[PDB]
Structures are given as C-alpha cells and as structure tokens.
Write a protein that binds this DNA or RNA. Structure first.
Lengths: 120, 114, 209, 56, 122
RNA sequence: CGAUGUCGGCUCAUCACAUCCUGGGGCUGAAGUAGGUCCCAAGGGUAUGGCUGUUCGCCAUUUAAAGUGGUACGCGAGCUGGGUUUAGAACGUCGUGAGACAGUUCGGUCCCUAUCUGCCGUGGGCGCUGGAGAACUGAGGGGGGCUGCUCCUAGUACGAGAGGACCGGAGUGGACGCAUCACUGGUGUUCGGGUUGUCAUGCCAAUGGCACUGCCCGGUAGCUAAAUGCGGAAGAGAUAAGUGCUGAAAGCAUCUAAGCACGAAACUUGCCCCGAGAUGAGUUCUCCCUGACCCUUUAAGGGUCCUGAAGGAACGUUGAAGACGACGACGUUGAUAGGCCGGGUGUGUAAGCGCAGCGAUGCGUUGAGCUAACCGGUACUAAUGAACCGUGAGGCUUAACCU
RNA sequence: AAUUCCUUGUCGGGUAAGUUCCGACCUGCACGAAUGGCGUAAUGAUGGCCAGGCUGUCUCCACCCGAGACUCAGUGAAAU
RNA sequence: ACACAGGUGGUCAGGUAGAGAAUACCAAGGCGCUUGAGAGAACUCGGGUGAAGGAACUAGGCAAAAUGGUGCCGUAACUUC
RNA sequence: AGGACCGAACCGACUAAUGUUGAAAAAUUAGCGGAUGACUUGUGGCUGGGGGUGAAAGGCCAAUCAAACCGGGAGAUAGCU
C-alpha cells in the first residue's frame, strides 16, 4: 500500500534496474543528453547526481567508489576530470528533464534528460 | 519534529556511560516490593543496543543460576538507575545474537583493552 | 464543552517519576480563533465556527477571504464547527487556546484514519483465510460464500466484502490528557489517535462518564 | 459467466457514453519561436520557454 | 505465550521433567498462557521416583517464558525456555519443595507467594 | 430426465424463538448457597481436542453457556473430495457361469474471463431555477451492546452447624471491535557487512557480474501484530411478565372499568459513522457579473458586436490519498518532488599508506568508510507568460412592508 | 482377520482423551490347506499406525520480491 | 491445424572447481524468446523471511521445512548368513 | 560376479501445484522410479477385423476399439422425439 516508500520498480527486478541505471548513467555522462522515458529519467536523476557529487572530491577512494557504481573507466575519467570540476559550485541540480512528446511504438511519454551546463 | 525533538530531550538523562556490545555491564535497577524500594543488580553481556535518542534501549544477557535471561532496558527510564561497565569486550558485530546459541566456553568474548 | 482543532505532531513517551512510560500523542493546538457564531434566531442551533493555522494569501479564494475578513480574523487552513452547550458564550474573533483543556482530565480525539486503499476482506473484515494447502485451488484469501441459495437469491445489504478501508472519520474516545502546555501550544494525550503525522485532529472533552 | 439475453444497442451506447476522448484542450504558444506545443513540453523545432534546447 | 500442545520444562522438583500444556484456563477461546497464568498440563516425562508419575493430568503455573514479560517502563524480560511449576489440581499451592531458576516479580500475588519464597532470583 | 450436482469438512452467513448464557419475574416440598418449575425477553454471546469420511456419538479438558431449528437437510459459476457411487483388483458370501452384495478393502480428472439482478467499493452526467466557494442542521440508514474473576460491604443477613448471601461499589481478566507505531518484535531482494565457486575490469591490491537476494548476518522508513491505547456504559422515555395505590360495577372484596405509580440486556433515545438525489433536492456566511444593437411566425424567442468576472478545469511538481477516476498539498511574490547541505539511524573500525610477522594476518591513522524511503534546512533542477470553460443582475402569480 | 453382520465385541498396550493401530480371547453371521494353509530375511513411488527431527500445515496470519490483475498506446477473440 | 513452452536418430565435445557428460561460472559460437509504456490496489500464480508455539492443520504431515559430501570411529533386533 | 548399490544421458511417470475457451485434443514446474538389463533405441520387415497382438488392462491395432477405417446394401428399421 506503499506509504512513503521511495523508488520506482519499472517493471523489472532489482538486478535489471541496477544494471539499467548503470548503463543509462554511463550514457548520460558520455553524451550529456539522452532521450529516455519520463519515469526512467526521473530515476536516473537519483542515480546520476550522486556520481557528480562524488566526483566533486577527487581521491583514489572516490575513483574506486565511483567505479564500483558505474563500472566503466572512461566514465570515471569524465567524472573527476571534466564534470566534477565543471559543476564544482552547483549545489545539486546537475541535470534537467525536458518532456518531449510520446513514442510512436508504444505511446510512452518520452523526455530528454540532460546535464545542466552543455554550454558547448 | 522540533516539537518532539525539543520535548524528548527534556527527559534524556545526561550521564549515560559509553558502552558498546560485547561489554559486561552491571545495571542497577529500582525494584519496588510493597513499601520498600530496593535497588537490584543485573550483570551480563550487552548483546544489542538500539540508539534512538529517548527511545534508546539495550539488551543485556545473563546466565542466571540455571538458564539465560535477556533484559532489554530502556536507557532513559528512571527505573534504570545505574549503568556501569565492568569488562570492556572485543567483538566484531553490532548485534551479538549468535551468543543465544552458545554456552560456556563457546560464548566467550575477548577483551578490548584499547 | 466545545473542542479545539489540533494537528497530529507524532508520538513520544513520557517517563513518569516512578518509572512508567506513557505513550503519548503530541497534538499542537494553536490559537483556534472564532470566525462565526450561530444562534437559534438565525440558524436554529448554537454553534461556533473556528479556524486555525495560517494559509497563503494567494491560495485563499475571494469567498473565503471575504468570510474571514468579515470575522475580522486572519485566514486559517480550514473552518470547523463546534456545537455549544447552552450556557457558553463566544464572540467573533475571540481566540481559544489549549488552556481550555487545563481541567478536562480525559478527551475524545477525532481524525481521519490512514487510508489503506482497496482492502480485501482478510485485512478489512478479519475474515479467516482458508487452507493454504490440502487441495485448495486458487481460493486462499477469498471471501468464501456470500449468501444462501434460492431462498433469498440475493446478497443481503451490508454483506462484508472487500473495498476501500481507511481514510475516514474515526473518533477515539476517553483518552487521558497527560499534559497541557500553554507555552508551546501542546496537548499530550495518552494513546494513539487517528491519522498520519500532520493530520488535522479535533479534540473535544469526553462525552462518556 | 455468459449473458442470458443479448444486450441491446441501447445498453451498448449507454456503456460507451464514457469512452469519449477529451480534446487537447488548448495548446500553448512558444515565447520566441511563436509556434504551438503541448504545455510543459518542447516544441517540434526543439524550443522550450523561449530558449533553444535540443537542436537535432 | 504458551498455548495447547506446548512442551514446557519444569521449574520445581516435583518429579516431572518435561510437561505438555493441554488447556489454557481462564476463559472461553482463550489462546495464550503467559506471565503467571494457570494451565492444565499432562506429564510427558518424569524422573523414576518423583512425586508425580508419567501421564498424570494436573495444573501448573507458567513461571518463565521465551516470549517474556513486559514491565511498565517498556522493558521486556525474555528467558530461554518456557517453564512451569506444577501446582496441585484441586487446591493449589504446588507440589514441589525446591524451585529451580529465576522467576519474575509478576508472581507477586497471594497464592504464588509460596513460589517466590523459594526461587533464588526475582 | 433437450441435467435443478445430493453426505461431510472449510470459508461466509442469515432469520425464527419452542432461550443454553446474561437480564426481569411468579410458585416452591424457596432458611442461606445451590436448585426445581413456569411466565417475560432475541440485545449480544454461545469451546478446543482424541477416535471416526462421518452429521451424530463416546471420551479428555475447558466455559457464563457450549441452545434448538429454518435458510435446495443455507453455502461446489466460493474451496475440498475423505464417504457414497464409473471403469482396475482382492476377500467373505451368492450363482454352473458371465457376474453380483447401502458387506469389506486398496487405487481412482471437480471446467467456466460475469451480460442482468444482488452486494461491496468508487466515479461521470444532470437536477436542485443567476453563477460560485465553504460551513452546516438533519429526514433517514448503519455500527455498537458479550462477560468472568478478585476485593470491600461481610464472614454480616440466614443457619443448630457446615456453610453463606440480596442490594451497592472498586479493581482486573477473557473473547470481540476501532485506532496506532511511542515501546517489544516481524518483514525490510532499494542500507551496511561476512563469505563459497567462477568470470571480468591488463596485472597485485580493490571492485563488479552470475550462482534462489548465491548463501548468510544485522537493519532505516513504511506496513504490521504477538505490541500498545480506547470501546461496549451511565442516564432518560415508553413498556413485557410481574408488583401495586385509590376505586366502583357487585352497599364487601377487587391492580382497572374512570384515575395513578413502579417495572428488563428487547423498544425509542443517549455513544460512533454515513447522510439534501431528503426531487420534500433545506439552512447559514461570503464572493462575482450593473454593455450596446438588429429580426420575427412577440415568445421566460432568436441573432450580431463588445465583454469573460467570482470560480473551475486543464497542465506541471506530487502526497502517510489512490486500481482508474476521486481527494489533499504546491506552481517561482515557491520547500511540491528531486538533488544538495547538516543531523540522525544502520552497519561496524573503508580504501590508500605505515609498522609487526616468513606468511595467512594483526595493529595505527579509525568508531573509519558507506549509509534507502527519516529529520532540519537550502531555489541548484523541474513546477511558463498565457490559453480553455464559466458571463453581463437572474421567470410568473399572490401576500406583507417600502418608517 | 483385505474375511466379523451384531460391533466402536471383550480384555490388554500406546494416548489427557484412540470407531483407526499392535497383542490377545474365539460366540469363524460367512477362514482353511496348490481357485493353496501358515510362517517368512530382503525388497516396494504398496496399505495402516506410532515416535524423533523439522517446519506458515495450523494457532493467525504479516511483510517483501517477481508475473498477471489496474491505467495508457497497438492488434483484437469466445461460450451465450 | 499456428512463426505451437510438445515429439525427433547419429556425430564433435575447450577452461576453472568437481568423481563426473551432474552442477556453478565461462571460451568458441549463438542468442535476449515479434506487443510495448506505466502504476505498485484486492485477488491469483512463482518465490523469500518470520516473534512464541511446533501437526494443535487434515480424510491423511498433502504441501513446505529438514536431512544431504569425503575420511575415520561406531552400529541392534532379525536373517535365507 | 550381479534381472547388484548410488547417480547423469536414456527410458519412464509416483505426488503436488499450475493449466483446464491450455503454450499443449495429456503438457509445464518442483520433487519421483529404473538406469548391464525380462533394458533402451534407429532402419527395414511380418501379423488385419470376430481377425491380429496382448508379463491381461477389454489394453492396443494411425488423437477412433465389449469388435478399426472407407465404400456399398441404404432413404436399414424407429408403435419414439
């Protein structure tokens, strides 16, 4: 009956959600803007933004702690080398969701989730 | 909950000693027998501590002249008069419930000494 | 007498001096301020309508704001009404504080209970579950039979079936008031009252003897 | 488990009285591009609240 | 929280060693015995020349439970093993003369006063 | 007979009263306690087990009591399938035999996505006569009514003694119901840790995937119960059986014919909830709208322009609200959600580096690191300016006032 | 007794309590000697009974993880 | 009858752990099962855990839980030895 | 050595649950029995309807069996609907 529980289930089991957000966080760090569904965007915030704040403090333990989460080494290069010093003063709010219509295949409410700089 | 946080800390006793599970503890408890108000002693290993401010408990396990007893105490109760740490104890967990299955030499906790 | 409108702050305990924990519910009762007085000569019944708390200026509508403006009072978060007891007298704009319960000794607390949604009859009506094994085919938590046979050939009214449990007005009666704190605007009653934390309560004196 | 008299077309339309689709109801006009879009969504050219976003 | 079919240990030296509860007395559809509650028991094991022999049906009072008792401050007292003292069936006040193990302050009543005159703790 | 499934168990009831308990009362071969019997009474309550397919019954141990019946011997489009009663097989018996025996024994497929009524919930439309926002009265409807034991009165009354009260009061249980999460706990595949096999990240170290969450150990919030609070009442009214008072018909007698008083868990209220579709559509408070101009088969008629209010709806961020609608909060003059900051909680003293040890490991930095839904803050992100719906003073008759 | 109607025969064992079970009696309605009698070690997805362990079977259910069920988009039956 | 969870003979048979062609994770190689997006009600199905009790369930321990390996010690009645 | 023991392939089908307008006109999942033998399997052959074959159930003989299927006698006959 759910009262105060947090976290979408997304019609997957726990290991498929964990894997899926690991990939999708990797893709948002890599490309800086991805188009996903609106619920997957809204959960991707709570996975991605803690990696940016971990990246705001560069140390070997945070590189390894952000390589346990995310499991990719290019990603923990861009965090800690580019994104962490990019934000660096921005307290939360590393990413915005922009609703962008519906799919054709199944009429799902899409949304572009992007990092909040992209000044390039 | 600044109302509840303000209202509970008006009741928290101040001199609660620092103990952690594994410690042998004597707890002196007010026991009332009709008109006389006695104070009796319950010594045993702390096997569990719940920290919640005013609602902080701790479970002490004794092997009383026969079988084993677990008293859970509310730490900030006025019944619980004294807590004193007899033997500081060295364990690795936080809740020592495995000791419910062990007696004698198996239920033997090393000393901490640091 | 009348009651006051509170707000469920949550639960704590109150250690007595002889070491008896009392589970209390903390009810913040701010200044309930009377917005309307009702007489027999205009309404057929004597009752006061009070408000409490505070509302945003842009969120109160013009009907509602005109009501509180006539009363000469700040807009609150709601309007409630208490029936008067034949020798009581209130004026519009009069503030009523938790101090009213400084004598009462035992109260009744009325709130909306926590909504449990569409509940089945085992949760809702305490029906007993059928066998979990021994042959049972797809009917473990189901309600069983629901009526008789050709005679009546109908299910009677108010047959206990499944549906919305929770989220309705319930009154808990005869709760011992543990403290009245006029400084912090608090009322500590012994026990659980209905509702989640932050829900609006209505605390009256107990009508039972 | 199955019907016992064929239901009419009356009762059929009565059941479908609620199957009606609601219109959009009015879709909003962008600040810069001046073009139309669902509210709180980005436009077909990829603007939102008068600034340029996506740009594919 | 002792119910029917529950094997209890024996705290006194009446001769029984392991008993089974067969009713919880004191009400209709009463489910549980408890802190100091009277039950009816049958004796499932005995020592060879005790006062009570195997398969007798008599009363007992529960003196310790694994579930435990709650004090008025919120403190609980759980034991490790359920135990009873075999009372006499007609006119109570129990059979045995020694009492082993601790008991609780909730047998502080008239009858069980005898049980807490013995009983090395509490 | 172009099919109305038939015992018993379970789940779920529901009515009758010819009442098992509780409540009132008369007679008693009623001293008291406990009874017997009869009248009144249907509010609520009214066992768990052994054996048996069993209903029943016997037994064990409870209980205030373990009621008697109707409801397709209530209930298989709700469950079971043990029994009876298919096809296999055997025993006893009958028949020469095929076979047969409500004699016995072992084995043996129970389908249905609900259209209509009913019922439990929950909405949309319209009405309620201008529109709208709230608060209400209350017709009516439903829920709830069980009860033990201990103590005092009082070891008094009664009785030769044994024994042992009425009436009244206090306490504390059982079963049931409502709420709740402060406590005690359960869960807690979203938090921390231990650990086995194997694979990968180049490798050591560190991590991650997979093996039921790999197996485990703890555990936040929430939900929860075995947890903790509360409830069933007092009181009033009208009575049943029953008891009377005055009092004739019937100069006595007589509770009744006139008149009057008591009298029970039943009845109407008192308590809790729903409740104006209560079309008999009620009340109260507040808010908003104070334009022109044509046409006709001149009507509470139609149309054009200008206006668009109070408010609602949509959209968005959402919620201890939720199947979906609905309901509640917030939308930048803003803490609604996420993030962030601080705290708490949980786990249990991370990684890296140093030292001791041949090494596994241990110790220091270090109660360290990591911490979900929690708590207190913070506009960093997303809650957009607008558009949409809703109008422009609200009919006729009669009456009382226009001071 | 896979056989016994009367029958839950009677006695004993096990159980707090045992129409089943084991032992015995024998009044075998209606056993009985290759349509074999009586024993019988081992074997049996065999029938009946008892006990230890173990447990959500149950007392009495609670929470959680998933797949449907519910909402949206696409396709789109059936008995009657 | 279907682009059907069924049936269909032979041949090859790598790593680590393992007695093993079991089983777990992998290589070569091949796949993600031709409807998806949400939400996170009752109820059904497949599972996890559970306080105290521990067959009281029931026609009946049905189902579930439990046991489970290798070496060594040790092992009763009865027996066709 | 063994119609020997444990256990995969392989053959089977004891229990439960699901499924029962199925994924399937007999299966799936979790356990289950045999597993060097009276075993199992491939390819071919032979036996035919009052006939075959049968470690026997009235089982099996092309989803059909107390007498197959097809065609014919044949518009059998039907005091019955």
């Amino acid at each position: 009956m759910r009262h105060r529980k947090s976290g979408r289930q997304l019609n997957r089991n726990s290991s498929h959600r964990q894997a899926m957000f690991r990939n999708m966080a990797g893709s948002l760090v890599r490309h800086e803007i991805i188009k996903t569904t609106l619920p997957k965007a809204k959960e991707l915030r709570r996975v991605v933004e803690p990696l940016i704040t971990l990246a705001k403090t560069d140390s070997v333990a945070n590189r390894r702690l952000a390589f346990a989460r995310t499991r990719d080494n290019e990603i923990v290069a861009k965090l800690f080398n580019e994104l962490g010093p990019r934000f660096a003063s921005r307290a939360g709010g590393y990413t915005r969701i922009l609703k962008c219509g519906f799919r054709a295949g199944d009429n799902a409410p899409m949304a572009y989730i992007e990092l909040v700089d992209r000044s390039e | 909950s600044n109302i509840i946080k303000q209202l509970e800390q008006e009741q928290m006793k101040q001199d609660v000693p620092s103990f952690r599970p594994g410690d042998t503890v004597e707890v002196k408890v007010w026991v009332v027998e009709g008109s006389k108000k006695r104070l009796q002693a319950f010594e045993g290993v702390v096997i569990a501590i719940r920290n919640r401010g005013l609602h902080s408990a701790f479970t002490v396990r004794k092997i009383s002249n026969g079988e084993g007893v677990e008293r859970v105490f509310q730490t900030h109760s006025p019944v619980v008069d004294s807590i004193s740490v007899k033997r500081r104890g060295a364990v690795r967990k936080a809740k020592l419930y495995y000791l419910r299955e062990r007696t004698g030499k198996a239920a033997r906790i090393k000393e901490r000494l640091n | 007498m009348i009651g006051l409108v509170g707000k469920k702050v949550g639960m704590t305990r109150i250690f007595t001096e002889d070491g008896v924990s009392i589970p209390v519910t903390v009810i913040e009762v701010e200044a309930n301020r009377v917005t309307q007085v009702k007489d027999l000569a205009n309404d057929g019944y004597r009752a006061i309508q009070v408000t409490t708390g505070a509302k945003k200026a842009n969120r109160v509508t013009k009907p509602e704001a005109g009501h509180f403006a006539k009363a000469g009072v700040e807009a609150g978060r709601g309007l409630w009404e208490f029936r008067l007891a034949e020798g009581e007298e209130f004026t519009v704009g009069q503030s009523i504080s938790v101090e009213l319960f400084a004598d009462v000794k035992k109260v009744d607390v009325t709130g909306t209970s926590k909504g449990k949604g569409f509940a089945g009859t085992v949760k809702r009506w305490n029906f007993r579950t059928q066998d979990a094994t021994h042959g049972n085919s797809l009917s473990h938590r189901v309600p069983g039979s629901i009526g008789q046979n050709q005679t009546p050939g109908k299910v009677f009214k108010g047959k206990k079936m499944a549906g919305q449990m929770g989220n309705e007005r319930v009154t808990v009666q005869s709760l011992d008031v543990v403290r009245v704190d006029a400084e912090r605007n608090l009322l500590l009653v012994k026990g659980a009252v209905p509702g989640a934390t932050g829900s609006d309560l209505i605390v009256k004196p107990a009508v039972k003897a | 488990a199955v019907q016992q008299n064929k239901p009419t077309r009356s009762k059929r339309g009565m059941r479908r009285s609620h199957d009606a689709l609601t219109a959009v109801t009015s879709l909003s006009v962008d600040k810069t591009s001046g073009e139309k879009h669902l509210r709180h969504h980005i436009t077909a050219d990829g603007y939102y609240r008068g600034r340029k976003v996506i740009a594919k | 929280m002792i119910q029917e079919q529950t094997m209890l240990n024996v705290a006194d030296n009446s001769g029984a060693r392991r008993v089974m509860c067969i009713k919880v007395l004191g009400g209709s559809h009463r489910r549980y015995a408890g802190v100091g509650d009277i039950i009816k028991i049958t004796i499932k094991e005995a020592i060879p020349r005790g006062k009570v022999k195997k398969g007798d049906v008599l009363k007992a009072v529960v003196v310790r439970t694994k579930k435990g008792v709650r004090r008025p401050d919120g403190s609980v007292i759980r034991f490790d093993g359920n135990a009873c003292v075999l009372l006499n069936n007609n006119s109570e006040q129990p059979i045995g003369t020694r009492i082993f193990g601790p008991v609780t302050r909730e047998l502080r009543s008239e009858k069980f006063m005898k049980i807490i005159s013995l009983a090395p703790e509490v």
